Amino acid sequence: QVFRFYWLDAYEDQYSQPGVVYLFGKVWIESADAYVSCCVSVKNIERTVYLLPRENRVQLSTGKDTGAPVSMMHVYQEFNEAVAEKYKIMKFKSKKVDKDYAFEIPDVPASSEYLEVRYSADSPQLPQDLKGETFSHVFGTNTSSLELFLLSRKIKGPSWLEIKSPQLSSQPMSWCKVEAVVTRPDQVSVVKDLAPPPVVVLSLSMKTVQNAKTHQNEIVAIAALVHHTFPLDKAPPQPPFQTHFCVLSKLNDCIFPYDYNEAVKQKNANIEIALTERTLLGFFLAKIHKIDPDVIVGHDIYGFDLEVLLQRINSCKVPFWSKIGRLRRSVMPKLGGRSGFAERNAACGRIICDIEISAKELIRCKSYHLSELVHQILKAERVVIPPENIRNAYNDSVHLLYMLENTWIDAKFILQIMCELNVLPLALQITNIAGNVMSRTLMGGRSERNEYLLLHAFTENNFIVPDKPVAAYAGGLVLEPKVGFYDKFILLLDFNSLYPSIIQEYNICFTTVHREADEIPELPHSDLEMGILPREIRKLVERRRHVKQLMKQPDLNPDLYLQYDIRQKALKLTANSMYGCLGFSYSRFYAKPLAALVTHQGREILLHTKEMVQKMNLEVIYGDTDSIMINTNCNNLEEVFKLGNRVKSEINKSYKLLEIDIDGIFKSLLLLKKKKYAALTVEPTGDGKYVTKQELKGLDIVRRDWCEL
DNA sequence: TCACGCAGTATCCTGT
RNA sequence: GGAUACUGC
Ligand SMILES: Nc1nc2c(ncn2[C@H]2C[C@H](O)[C@@H](COP(=O)(O)OP(=O)(O)OP(=O)(O)O)O2)c(=O)[nH]1
Ligand SMILES: [Mg+2]
Ligand SMILES: [Mg+2]
């Protein structure tokens, strides 16, 4: 009876079905002794709102303070008599909860006794600014259903969930193989310490042609590579694809060169030849339904691939468009909108991986075209089929087969790139750390991840989170450089996780600093307890540190090492974003004061460090917001290292959690301008010997807007 | 429906 | 005064 399944994606429709969340994932079946797709519909996720009592009764804001003390009974009576009837709410359940609060709404105390009202999602929605006579504010009016489910059930990222007493479905509701319905959200729980299951993956590449008359792109070939046991916690499987399927359709005008039959006969039996685009799209939809991939990967999938797929399906009236997704629906989502949210909805329940977004997030390249990505990652050369030659290729069997094989090779390249960067395992790790949905993580961006991280952190610690929204401050300090050429060892001292360590050390948090709705707030007292933001930051930092320790293992494979490096970078960025969102205008946690303070402290720190170095009678020639370059004026490497250690210790002696380390020893330096220099980093091998590696920072030579020559 | 912060260097244009 | 790029942290 207990349904144990691994959940990968969640989809909700705020307008069609209120209070229903469609989780999708994998379940284990002994009859087939394998893993099959499952769709669980959590129902009746009741709206929860919090009412804040007033200290003194106010005559509907007309007579102002009246002097009558207000208790929870007064608030409940006011809600039951006036608000409920006015806004057409039939049935609700109310209780009292003591909750804390520290955010950007004034007159809301730190810890207050709120009245929590729970009522179905079918009823209307109370206004945000609703003010009565006993309560001064209402929180949670527009909270989404998925957010409520995830936060209430403490679900963070893909994981194993147990459902008690599942129910079947009166009629089919999904294209999966197993379905269940949960009548309450309390029946779903998370079970920890279990391995992720394998997930099917389909890498697809399309080749189209632009019909000038309609200016609409028409599909002529599709290729797909499918793996049925792709892991989410281990290295990619070699080879990266198990099976494949290719479909080729004749254009609306041209005809085959009277030899396609023999060509396909002698080539292979896995190529399906169709005569009309309708048949091609139908066969593709049927194949997608049969394979049932949990991850669909491609290049420009959000931009061109899926948009053109849906457009052609609509134009050709191909039956059963919903096969492209995992939920059976009648009305297509509206074509348009920013990014690919319409495309995401069209493929609801199926994770979509655009290697362009992941490449932009993970690595840096001059261009993110497929050719450049293959050149830089896989180190291979990809041939390009001119757009004007695809149409003319329908004149010989050899050329058409070559076109189809080119599409196949493009799909293989996409899958190989996906495997190389560890897009999927890294996405899973980031999602688990943050707590968002995996599709959101793979769509790119940083705001959502930190938003959900802080949401979970605050909800777990008995807080009322804000309501979703419906050069502004000083930054770092860049010391004036002594531009020139230095032929002696240059010692670079860099701080470790500067801003996160500042947040931890000085205890900068929402609940610690006293903000007032553009001046730098005072540092919080040292007699308080560590807040939520510091603790979370610490966690992230520790994760990164552990990864670095792994990177330090001796005799490690190159590729694996690189992977670890990428991971480190990701985590660092996450922490930095946890800082930066504090000054993000459109963030759910806009706390510009706090961020300002952070930066200010950083500046102070740098200043102090510089002063100390000068008190040691050394020379300081550069520094960018956490670093100092010292002209050792020496040529004995060992001695330089000694000095490093010395100053390092000295600096550390002033701080508890902050740390400074030797970020590099430059044999020679060419310091041109602020944030523009070159050097020969010294990597010691042992016995006093060392190798030199060229390093450039900010020079035009490392910019993409100049001719390669 | 979206989207991390700020400091800094380089190039180019201002008619109806 | 403005506009367009992309480095640094
Ligand atoms: N908001 C934001 N801030 C950043 C980003 N990159 C760097 N910073 C800021 C915050 C960092 O604490 C500060 C110091 O830069 P670093 O590159 O030396 O990183 P950090 O010291 O945090 O760690 P590390 O020296 O690599 O161990 O610069 C970023 O991508 N976003
Ligand atoms: Mg640093
Ligand atoms: Mg000026």
Q: Give the residue, out of A543, A581, A626, A628, with the most ligand 1 atoms within 8 A of its beta carbon, to mutate for a pocket test.
A: A626
CB A533 within 8 A of CB A512: no
CB A654 within 8 A of CB A478: no
Report the separation in Å between the CA atom of A676 and the middle of ligand 1, taken as the mean of its atom positions.
17
Which one-letter DSSP state was computed for residue A250?
Answer: -
Report the separation in Å between the CA atom of A677 and the middle of ligand 1, taken as the mean of its atom positions.
18
Q: Is the CB of A494 under 6 A from ligand 1?
A: yes
Q: Which two tokens stand for residue A548?
A: 């670095």
Report the separation in Å between the CA atom of A499 and the middle of ligand 2, taken as the mean of its atom positions.
9
Q: Which amino acid is at A357?
A: I
Q: Which nucleotides of C are covered by protein (CB under 7 A)?
A: 5-9
Is the C-beta atom of A383 closer than 7 angstroms to strand B?
A: no
Q: Is the CB of A580 under 6 A from ligand 1?
A: yes
Which residue(s) pair with A217 in the sheet? A210
A655 burial via Cβ count (<10 Å: 0-12, 13-18, 19+)? middle
Give the span between the Cα atoms of A208 and A311, in whole angstroms: 13
Torsion of CA A646, A651, A655, A657, to 10 degrees: -70
Fold (CATH) for A47-153: Alpha-Beta Plaits (3.30.70)
Q: Which two tokens stand for residue A547?
A: 């990864």
The Cβ-side half-sphere exposure at A561, using a 13 Å CA radius, reads: 8
Question: Is A199-450 the same fold as A47-153?
Answer: no
CA distances from A14 to A22, A146, A469, A489, A695 (A): 12, 10, 16, 63, 52
Q: Is the CB of A498 under 6 A from ligand 1?
A: yes
CA A654 to chain centre: 37
Q: Give the residue, out of A361, A495, A547, A600, with the most ligand 1 atoms within 8 A of its beta carbon, to mutate for a pocket test.
A: A495
Q: Is the CB of A450 under 6 A from ligand 1?
A: no
Resolution (A): 11.1
Q: Is the CB of A254 under 6 A from ligand 1?
A: no
Q: Is the CB of A659 under 6 A from ligand 1?
A: no
CB A667 within 8 A of CB A489: yes
Q: Is A430 helix (H, G, I), strand (E, B) or coil?
A: helix
Q: Whose CA is nearest to atom 23 of ligand 1?
A: A497
Find the distance separating the first CA and the last CA of chain A, reported in whole Å: 69
Instruction: Look at strands A199-211 and A295-298 and give their pairing.
Output: parallel
CA distances from A468 to A123, A452, A465 (A): 20, 12, 9
Q: Residue ranges of the alpha helices (H) in A213-305? A: 260-267, 277-291
Q: Over the range A617-654, which residues count as b (16 or more CB within 10 Å of their CB) and which as e?
A: ebebbbbbbbbbbbbbeeeebeebbebbeebbeebeee
Is the C-beta atom of A18 closer than 7 angstroms to strand B?
A: no
Q: Which two tokens stand for residue A136?
A: 């001064």
CA A433 to chain centre: 10
CB A8 within 8 A of CB A199: yes
Degrees, nearest 5: CA angle A269-A272-A273: 120
Which residue(s) pair with A199 in the sheet? A230
The Cβ-side half-sphere exposure at A639, using a 13 Å CA radius, reads: 7
**Nearest ligand (C-alpha, residue A575):** 1
User: What CATH number was assigned to the domain covering residues A199-450?
Assistant: 3.30.420.10
Give the span between the Cα atoms of A473 and A596, in whole angstroms: 6
Describe the strand order of the beta sheet including A243-249 as a list of residue ranges: A271-274, A243-249, A216-230, A199-211, A295-298, A351-354
Rounded to a whole number of angstroms, the CA Rg of chain A reads 30
Q: Which two tokens stand for residue A629?
A: 């370059």
